[PDB]
């Protein structure tokens, strides 16, 4: 019923109030996003948008949540979708 995440000092508190949620296959999310947790931090700084992954539907769907401006959310979403499409080819 609770999930914890770390908010970098540089991310405004005004931008955790309207996330963007999209769903995709779980294994695709594992292949693309990975698990290093430092690669993900670097790419978050680059896009200026936070990213989270949570397994849903018995491990067949992931709930990707993206925070930031609408433009930052669009940038992060498009990067993820491009990589995923590469995988699905």
Partner 1 sequence: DLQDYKAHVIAKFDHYDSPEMKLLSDAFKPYQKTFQPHTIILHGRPGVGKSALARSIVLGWAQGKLFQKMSFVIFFSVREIKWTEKSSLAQLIAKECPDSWDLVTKIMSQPERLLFVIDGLDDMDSVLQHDDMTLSRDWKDEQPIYILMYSLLRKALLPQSFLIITTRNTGLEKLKSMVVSPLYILVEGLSASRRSQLVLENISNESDRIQVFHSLIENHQLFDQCQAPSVCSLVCEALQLQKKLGKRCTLPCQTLTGLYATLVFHQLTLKRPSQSALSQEEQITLVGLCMMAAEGVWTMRSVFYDDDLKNYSLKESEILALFHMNILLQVGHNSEQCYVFSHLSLQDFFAALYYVLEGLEEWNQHFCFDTRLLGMKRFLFGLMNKDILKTLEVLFEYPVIPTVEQKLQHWVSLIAQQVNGTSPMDTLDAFYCLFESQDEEFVGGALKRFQEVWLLINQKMDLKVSSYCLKHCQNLKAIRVDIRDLLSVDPLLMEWWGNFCSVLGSLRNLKELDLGDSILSQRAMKILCLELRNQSCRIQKLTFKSAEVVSGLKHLWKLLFSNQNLKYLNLGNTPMKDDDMKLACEALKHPKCSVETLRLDSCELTIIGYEMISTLLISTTRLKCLSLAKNRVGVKSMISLGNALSSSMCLLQKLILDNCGLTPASCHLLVSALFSNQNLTHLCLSNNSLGTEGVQQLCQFLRNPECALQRLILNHCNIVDDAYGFLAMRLANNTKLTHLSLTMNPVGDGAMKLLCEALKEPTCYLQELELVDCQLTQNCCEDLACMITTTKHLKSLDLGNNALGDKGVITLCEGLKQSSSSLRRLGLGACKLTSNCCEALSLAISCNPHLNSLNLVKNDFSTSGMLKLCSAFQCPVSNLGIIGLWKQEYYARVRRQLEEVEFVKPHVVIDGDWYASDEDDRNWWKN
Partner 2 sequence: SYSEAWGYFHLDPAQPRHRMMSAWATCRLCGLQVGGLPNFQMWTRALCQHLSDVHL
Partner 3 sequence: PQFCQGFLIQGLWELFMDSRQKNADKFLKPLSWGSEVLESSCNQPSTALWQLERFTVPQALQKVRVLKHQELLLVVAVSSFTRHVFTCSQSGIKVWNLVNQVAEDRDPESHLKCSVQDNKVYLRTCLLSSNSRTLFAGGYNLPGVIVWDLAAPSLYEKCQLPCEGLSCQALANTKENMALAGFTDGTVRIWDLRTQEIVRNLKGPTNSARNLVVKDDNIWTGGLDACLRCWDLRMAKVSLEHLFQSQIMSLAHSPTEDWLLLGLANGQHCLFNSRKRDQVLTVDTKDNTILGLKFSPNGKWWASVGMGNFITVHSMPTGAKLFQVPEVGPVRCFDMTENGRLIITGSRDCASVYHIKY
| The one segment of 2-10, 13-21, 28-36, 55-63 that binds partner 2 by CB under 8 A | 28-36
**In the set 16, 20, 61, 79, which binds partner 2 (CB under 8 A)?**
79
Residue 2, number of CB atoms within 10 A of its CB: 3
Strands (E) in 14-60, as ranges, are: 20-25, 51-52, 55-56
**In the set 18, 27, 31, 45, which binds partner 3 (CB under 8 A)?**
45
> Any contact of residue 38 with partner 1 (CB under 8 A)?
no
Residue 60 Rama label (left phi>0; alpha psi -120 to 50; beta): alpha
By CB under 8 A, name the binding residues for partner 3.
6-10, 12, 14-15, 41, 45, 48, 69-71
């Amino acid at each position: 019923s609770l999930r914890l995440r770390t908010r970098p000092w540089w991310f405004p508190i005004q931008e955790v109030s309207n996330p963007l949620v999209l769903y995709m296959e779980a294994w695709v999310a594992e292949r693309v996003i990975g698990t290093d947790q430092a690669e993900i931090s670097e790419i978050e700084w680059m896009c200026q948008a936070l990213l989270t992954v949570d397994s849903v539907n018995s491990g067949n769907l992931a709930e990707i949540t993206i925070f930031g401006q609408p433009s930052a959310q669009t940038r992060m979403k498009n990067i993820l979708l491009n990589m995923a499409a590469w995988h699905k080819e």
